[PDB]
Amino acid sequence: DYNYKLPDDFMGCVLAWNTRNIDATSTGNYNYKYRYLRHGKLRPFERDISNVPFSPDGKPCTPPALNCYWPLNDYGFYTTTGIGYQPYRVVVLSFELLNAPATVCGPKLSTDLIKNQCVNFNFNGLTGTGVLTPSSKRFQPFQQFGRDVSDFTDSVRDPKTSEILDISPCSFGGVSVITPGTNASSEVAVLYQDVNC
């Protein structure tokens, strides 16, 4: 982790799998190395390929002088070793929550958009629901989600047709009910929808 740092903030998927058969040669495998000494630490998603001759004080060196070590490790493998020393090919799948125009789909067939109220819209990363409605909002081309006052996405530019449309929610509200006396009459409780009629 002192060589490859994954941050607390941004995160993806870490994928390791065993390679006793391929990499763990019976006589040795010294193609792979890693640094074990470095001035300070590494920032996340940031590395140092360079084979800088390390010194604990900071002076430049020429080995094998006093406290002039090579940073890389003679990091070999054997198939006769235990599972804790076997090599593991690790692929780290960092994603982008930074919603640019998208790359991965995980394919579903894309339907046609409708002005109809109450559509379960599933755009690129918006599994919301509401009323798709075209809007006059400007959208400089490096932004494609619109927000109004808070957390909720107000408007989206469509990913297929680049049409600018704002989202209204499914037209909720409270139902209130007028009754006269139930002893007077069980006749129909008339209602409220706090909504456009």
Partner 1 sequence: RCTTFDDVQAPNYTQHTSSMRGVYYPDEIFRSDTLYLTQDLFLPFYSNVTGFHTINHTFDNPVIPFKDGIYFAATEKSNVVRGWVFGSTMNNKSQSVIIINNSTNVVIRACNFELCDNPFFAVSKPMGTQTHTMIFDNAFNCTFEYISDAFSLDVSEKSGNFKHLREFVFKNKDGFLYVYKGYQPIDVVRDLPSGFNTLKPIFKLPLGINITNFRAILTAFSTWGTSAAAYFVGYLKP
Residues making contact with partner 1 (CB under 8 A) = 7, 9-10, 43-52, 98-100, 137-140, 142-149, 155
Nearer to ligand NAG, 52 or 79 (CB): 52
CA atoms of 15 and 31, how far apart (whole Å):
21
Q: How far is the CB of 84 from partner 1 (least distance, A)?
A: 29
Nearer to ligand NAG, 51 or 67 (CB): 51
Which partner, partner 1, ligand NAG, none, binds residue 39 by CB below 5 to 8 Å per kind? ligand NAG
- The verdict on whether omega for the bond into residue 64 sits within 30 degrees of 0, i.e. cis, is yes
Nearer to partner 1, 48 or 194 (CB): 48
Q: How far is the CB of 68 from ligand NAG (least distance, A)?
A: 17
Which partner, partner 1, ligand NAG, none, binds residue 59 by CB below 5 to 8 Å per kind? none
Nearer to partner 1, 148 or 194 (CB): 148
Residues that bind ligand NAG (CB under 6 A): 39-40, 42-43, 49, 160-161
Nearer to ligand NAG, 40 or 141 (CB): 40
Which partner, ligand NAG, partner 1, none, binds residue 160 by CB below 5 to 8 Å per kind? ligand NAG
97, 103, 107, 111 alpha-carbon torsion, rounded to 10° = 90
Tokens found for residue 4: 């490859």
Return the exposure string of 104-135: e unless at least 16 CB atoms fall within 10 Å of the residue's CB, then b: eeeeeeeeebeeeeebebebeeeeeebbbeeb
Q: How far is the CB of 188 from partner 1 (least distance, A)?
A: 44
